[PDB]
Design a protein around this ligand. Structure first.
Ligand SMILES: OC[C@H]1O[C@H](OC[C@H]2O[C@H](OC[C@H]3O[C@H](OC[C@H]4O[C@H](OC[C@H]5O[C@H](OC[C@H]6O[C@@H](O)[C@H](O)[C@@H](O)[C@@H]6O)[C@H](O)[C@@H](O)[C@@H]5O)[C@H](O)[C@@H](O)[C@@H]4O)[C@H](O)[C@@H](O)[C@@H]3O)[C@H](O)[C@@H](O)[C@@H]2O)[C@H](O)[C@@H](O)[C@@H]1O
Ligand SMILES: OC[C@H]1O[C@H](OC[C@H]2O[C@H](OC[C@H]3O[C@H](OC[C@H]4O[C@H](O)[C@H](O)[C@@H](O)[C@@H]4O)[C@H](O)[C@@H](O)[C@@H]3O)[C@H](O)[C@@H](O)[C@@H]2O)[C@H](O)[C@@H](O)[C@@H]1O
Lengths: 586, 587
């Protein structure tokens, strides 16, 4: 009766009319932790409810637990219901949690959440951000943290919280200044920073401190940095490299330093040590600005910037006793960081206008996997609808979903959600684009999916060369326009096939610069052919954040053979944006 | 066997180059069953008369597919040329090594090799070069230059800055072409030299490519009938047309850019090109691009993302002209778009430091072109060597130039670097301040023979292999890291192939060597390579290198073994200097 085909499942009639929300107390759980599932009921059935709430805990295709609770709730009344569960003992596992409201012998509402059991964020990063630190009650800060925990975000990057790039702590360790100007002359309140950190930590969220690897203000000599540590655009120390900034900001430019200079390292590590002593950050998120052209140290020797990164980052980790993440802009330095630096995971920011094609969302994640020999996960910053980011306007709910399907299916994570809603540009506080209610609802599904299926998306997978066909439909393996983008991967116990619908896409630009993409065409009851070596295939499944909020469905299939060999012919009921087929092997 | 180098009757070492002065062929590529003419130039510098035998062996990978011999009497200080005729075997898209030996008594005293490519079309195995200067000159002089380039088996040549204007390539009319004109840099171009080169190139089965941008026009383009409505703009109000700035002394101060998706621009530039192709018998339009332009808009203020306009422009150009098309995607800007959607003969990528400085990019550029085309298009790379010293009069670094070619060729690529001025040092092809030393020329002859002769093992039906490689005692990498042997494996029908590229003398993984000061790699002799291979139906193990006996295959000793990581072949390698290709023949 919890099956949606079943005549005793009228959920489509009454969806969201009893179950208002479902979420958990934390972002991440240690094995055997108590998990608290929180259910918010709001009876909008215009009728009193006297029934039962069913909860199923699922690991991929399997039921790993269930619970039921009788609940009455009168028309127009609200209630909360908490369900308590012990996280299973296996580390690094994702689960879907399915909640059903049942009256009589019939399911009348359903909503899902997810649970990530991971002892460390670094295998399955789900990075978000906080860009604003105004004076506000701890109570208001707690509400923002609760909002973000809905998406199971397990890391938060605090963007432009610090005082100076070469002196992040305002005041001193013995007496910290409670208020200061950031880079853009915004007011930052230290107590808001501290509150966010504590609230994050109570939900097992890692908190990351943004600063550049190599930046200092116009007046860096006053604070005790030397021109002799600098990075220069010429071999005669005339023009120190720099990042120009708008004239109302705290300094007219950030001057750049040589990361390989040992005096810069000692100086910046000491300044950060002070910041980490006052503000209980877990991570230093080390920013970079990407390739800088031909550059030189003070004495005119050329500097190969990317060759300096790993040494800097490993020394920084040792100096601070904290975790490190480095942003390799446009993959500049990614090979060097992936193979040599003890970073928690890889982080790649795309700046435009190269890397516009959908395939780069996949390929960036593939490069991170290959250059790390499969040891590091990859986070992508890929700012959606960037061409309209100076408009008072909305994120396009279609292109945002396709971009996330592209990154998530490839085994990546997309840094996009935060206190201001969603990122529209590299300056995180810029918030001219808002998420509509429909997009928010999509993101809840997509982030539940990213969590519950993490074991099939980015755990022990290799690329498969088994051929896929979708008879009658144009396909591509690389995100080409007017195709279903499809490719396969394999791991121990499972083969996974992804289908991403670009049939509505005329031009394969993931960014959707006018914010005007449309709903993909919907294909129902079609066939996929998967050319498989082995015969011991008992079951084939599908899950999609577009279909019943990520609930697994068993698919019909047949074993067949034609001129290209043996294959499974898989019956697929529906594709909207993104479907994940998964085949259970031995 | 007196021809093997380990044999004591082979004393080639002492008298190398003292009798066989050169070996080469009449054409760049051959159709199946064409007559192949191998030309052997003798110059007896032995200081005694020679009365012996010249042996020619025709090799396909490990196997002898033919042989010939001719006894020769040649006196001390005499020169003679032999012409030896062979029939190209019937299988298309095959490369061969041609080994020439001078034997006196039972002793081999000299050796020189060349190669032969049997290909009915250049596009599978492109070997692209250039011609940059078109002064007034005799056909006989043009023929000598084509002969020099043919030594390297170049099967296509890009004519760079031959044309009159980027928006009007033909000077004069079709019926009355101007016999000469000024190019974009105000150099004198002679029409007859362009024509002579085209004709000479065709006689050797060399494709000739006409350079011009996709979307460029001179400062006075309105006079020539082009409209600013077709243009590409840096703002949405059509205030400032996008442009490529040029020196003030040149024919135009700048090249104004147009929107390739504008059908009126297409129609105009296709007609302009149609006239040039009616006069000059070019085979290919090599369509230039400048790479990313930032945010650009059409005349009405609509944003244009350039990379997504390329494929359709190129396909329309091909259909309008009836000619072959190639398009350069600068730093891969547009590469996926062209590779997946354009009917180009092959892919072409300029790659630039600092972003793409790492050795890995030489391989990854080729891998991308291959993956994005679903294995259907070959890739050519432009990577201008020793760029940092290229404004002053000097020599190329012979070590970094070899390592760059090893990396490109091993990956299944080709490198556009050789032409009328010697070798490329800048993106402005005529800039020729760097010269190749004699020793580099000698290496390039070897490397281009190797590129041709081993084309079937380098870029014909190969996939990446995940079979483990170890080199005990030596640091290795799969990605061109500094202070390693760069090694990886590929497999095809009948062969596994293992490349080793020696980056042990490299401090920083940077292929360009901007100061021109890279050193000879260390030489590693008599070492072991472990190659973990499941199947044991192995026929033999071979090695070829352009650094060792001019590309001649050697059979290697190996042993079947097993340790905790699985079964492996322990392969004994006599020597690695720059680049070895091991290949393993399956049963
Ligand atoms: O007189 C003293 C000077 O002489 C010499 O330099 C002359 C000029 O050469 C070039 O311009 C002449 C040619 O212009 C057109 O073709 C331009 C080139 O098109 C391709 O290369 C594109 C691009 O590559 C490099 O930039 C990479 C990348 O960098 C980013 O910063 C940028 O945002 C991206 O858009 C860009 O893709 C390179 O730095 C840049 O110069 C190039 O524009 C193609 O592969 C090249 O072969 C081709 O040259 C025109 O179509 C041609 O007919 C014409 O010959 C050069 O662009 C000018 O900068 C030079 O002034 C000496 O070499 C120089 O030292 C001296 O200053
Ligand atoms: O009048 C409005 C105009 O300015 C606005 O944009 C402001 C600037 O934003 C960025 O620079 C500020 C930023 O600079 C460094 O960080 C640069 C980037 O590097 C990191 O690695 C990271 O990945 C990025 O998120 C980060 O932005 C400092 O380290 C950091 O503290 C500062 O915030 C741009 O780089 C500048 O070009 C901009 O001027 C407005 O958004 C624009 O639309 C207007 O141009």
């Amino acid at each position: 009766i919890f099956s949606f085909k079943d005549d005793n499942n009228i959920v489509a009639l009454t969806k969201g009319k009893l179950i208002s929300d479902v979420y958990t107390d934390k972002a991440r759980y240690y094995p055997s932790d108590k998990v608290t599932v929180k259910i918010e009921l709001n009876n909008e059935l215009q009728e009193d409810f006297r029934g039962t709430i069913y909860i199923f805990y699922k690991h991929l295709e399997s039921i790993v637990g269930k619970a039921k609770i009788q609940v009455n709730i009168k028309s127009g009344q609200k209630k909360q219901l908490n369900i308590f569960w012990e996280a299973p003992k296996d580390d690094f596992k994702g689960y879907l949690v399915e909640v059903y409201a049942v009256k009589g012998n019939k399911a009348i509402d359903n909503k899902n959440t997810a649970v990530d059991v991971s002892s460390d964020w670094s295998k399955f990063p789900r990075y978000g951000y906080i860009a604003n630190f105004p004076e506000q009650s701890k109570e208001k800060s707690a509400l923002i943290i609760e909002d973000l925990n809905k998406y199971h975000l397990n890391g938060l990057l605090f963007y432009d919280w610090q005082y100076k790039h070469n002196k992040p702590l305002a005041g001193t360790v013995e007496n910290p200044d409670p208020k200061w100007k950031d880079i853009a002359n915004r007011d930052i309140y230290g107590q808001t920073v501290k509150d966010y950190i504590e609230l994050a930590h109570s939900k097992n969220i890692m908190v990351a401190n943004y600063n550049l690897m190599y930046g200092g203000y116009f007046d860096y000599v006053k604070d005790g940095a030397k021109p002799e540590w600098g990075l220069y655009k010429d071999p005669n120390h005339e023009e120190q490299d720099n990042h120009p900034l708008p004239h109302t900001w705290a300094t007219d430019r950030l001057y750049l330093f040589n990361p390989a200079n040992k005096d810069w390292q000692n100086y910046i590590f000491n300044a950060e040590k002070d910041a980490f002593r006052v503000y209980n950050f877990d991570v230093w998120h080390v920013g970079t600005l990407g390739p800088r052209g031909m550059v030189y140290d003070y004495n005119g020797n050329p500097v190969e910037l990317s060759f300096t990164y790993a040494d800097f980052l490993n020394n920084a980790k040792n100096a601070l006793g904290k975790r490190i993440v480095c942003n390799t802009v446009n993959e500049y330095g990614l090979i060097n960081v992936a193979s040599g630096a003890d970073v928690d995971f890889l982080y790649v920011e795309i700046w435009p206008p190269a890397r516009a094609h959908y395939n780069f969302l996949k390929q960036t994640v593939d490069n991170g996997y290959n250059y790390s020999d499969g040891k590091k996960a990859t986070v992508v910053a890929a700012y959606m609808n960037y061409g309209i980011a100076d408009r008072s306007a909305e994120f396009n709910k279609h292109s945002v979903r396709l971009t996330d399907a592209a990154i998530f299916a490839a085994g990546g994570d997309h840094i996009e959600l935060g206190d201001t809603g969603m990122l529209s540009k590299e300056y995180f506080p810029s918030a001219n684009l808002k998420m509509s209610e429909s997009l928010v609802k999509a993101m809840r599904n997509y982030y539940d999916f990213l969590t519950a299926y993490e074991n099939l998306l980015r755990d022990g997978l290799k690329e498969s060369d088994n051929k896929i066909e979708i008879p009658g439909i144009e396909i591509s393996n690389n995100g080409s326009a007017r195709t279903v983008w499809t490719y396969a991967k394999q791991k121990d116990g499972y083969d996974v096939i992804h289908m991403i619908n670009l049939l509505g896409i005329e031009v394969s630009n993931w960014r959707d610069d006018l914010g005007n993409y449309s709903a993909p065409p919907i294909i129902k009851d079609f066939k996929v052919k998967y050319y498989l070596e082995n015969d011991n295939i008992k079951n084939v499944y599908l899950a999609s954040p577009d279909i019943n909020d990520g609930k697994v469905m068993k698919l019909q299939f047949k074993k067949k053979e034609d001129s290209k060999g043996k294959y499974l012919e898989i019956s697929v009921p529906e594709l909207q944006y993104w479907d994940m087929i998964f085949i259970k092997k031995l």
